[PDB]
């Protein structure tokens, strides 16, 4: 007579089905190659946004094979923060839920000052703020590794890997948010931000992208279930 | 009557991963939407499967996209055309000799990776493929798993970076390396294992393929896969030429 929490979270489709773990309050797909997530999916409602982040010491999720885990020593002295894809601030409903965002499977190496602690946090705060006035909200977040044109006229994907376990440092991060403003009607916002120092004055809407750019770059199918006729607003328009 | 269906036969020793699985007539493939090439392919050979059926030829085969994957994740001939790289088949055409359809399917672009031509695809990597077929003729069953790798390199700032070119309008990944893992059943339930990693680069003809031996664990860590992961370790009598 009640849904599974994971069916509630994944109502609008799985971005992909690779190495999926269902936690107490979010769903994650893990990439054995990069040692960080392919994507995480979250479902917020006002009531669920109404515990501690302090009783939270990051650790590996050991239900993945040991040879494919990342560890604290990979992030230590690397210059990068442990950046949680499913934000701790989105899960205030029990200590277990929030603790689970501190699994290293939910972490990616992120620029600290100028990004994770700042602009990227502003994006996370923006989604909670909007979710509070919405009925249901669905958020997909993940790392990107994007090509750049180099001086030989060729395109290359280049990214750092850190630690003995070679954890990938994403070039960018995506976040797509689906907001249910009235029953069966949705606003859609898609963003791609660079994993780099972002000038604090830059508005988040500058990082708006077509949803197709996220999908094509990520190799994922986002909100596949959804009917395009149900979207009343995209990236702030219409 | 009980003789196994083809897919179950090929995958007897397990799926190395479960992502975007495509079962063809005579090989199984896992496709990577991100890189626009395979995660891995798996093949099964026997001495009888390595005898050419008359009238089957690579002559009438041409490369073509597998249009059963979503359009935004397809690679196209035009991505490879004039790119500086060959369409390198992971599941090799030469391993598939019993039917025209079987070999036609190795020409799907899902089974192709951009490979350096002279001194690799056409030379040293082909030497490895020939080796595996040579050994396979002497074995009861032979299982081969082949895939691309994207491996880091130390740079001047002392940090490690993965760097690879992406080609064409669809940004198909050019792997830095390729792995091949072969499991040869020498006597019933008794297996020899051979693992290799070669760079996607010009390799001198005089280098023996054995120089590219690497531990199976090395392959799995780099590939992010679990290869021949249901084997009883007792069943393995030889690894990379030793035991």
UniProtKB/Swiss-Prot annotation, chain A:
Predominant subcellular localization, coarse grouping: mitochondrion
KO phenotype (gene knockout): RNAi-mediated knockdown results in accumulation of apoptotic DNA in 1.5-fold stage embryos and delayed appearance of embryonic cell corpses during development.
Enzyme class, broadest EC rank: hydrolase
Protein name: Endonuclease G, mitochondrial
Location of this chain's protein in the cell: Mitochondrion
Cofactor: Mg(2+)
Organism: Caenorhabditis elegans
Molecular function terms, GO-annotated: DNA endonuclease activity; double-stranded DNA endonuclease activity; endonuclease activity; metal ion binding; protein homodimerization activity; RNA endonuclease activity; sequence-specific DNA binding; single-stranded DNA endodeoxyribonuclease activity
Keyword line: Apoptosis, Disulfide bond, Endonuclease, Hydrolase, Magnesium, Metal-binding, Mitochondrion, Nuclease, Transit peptide
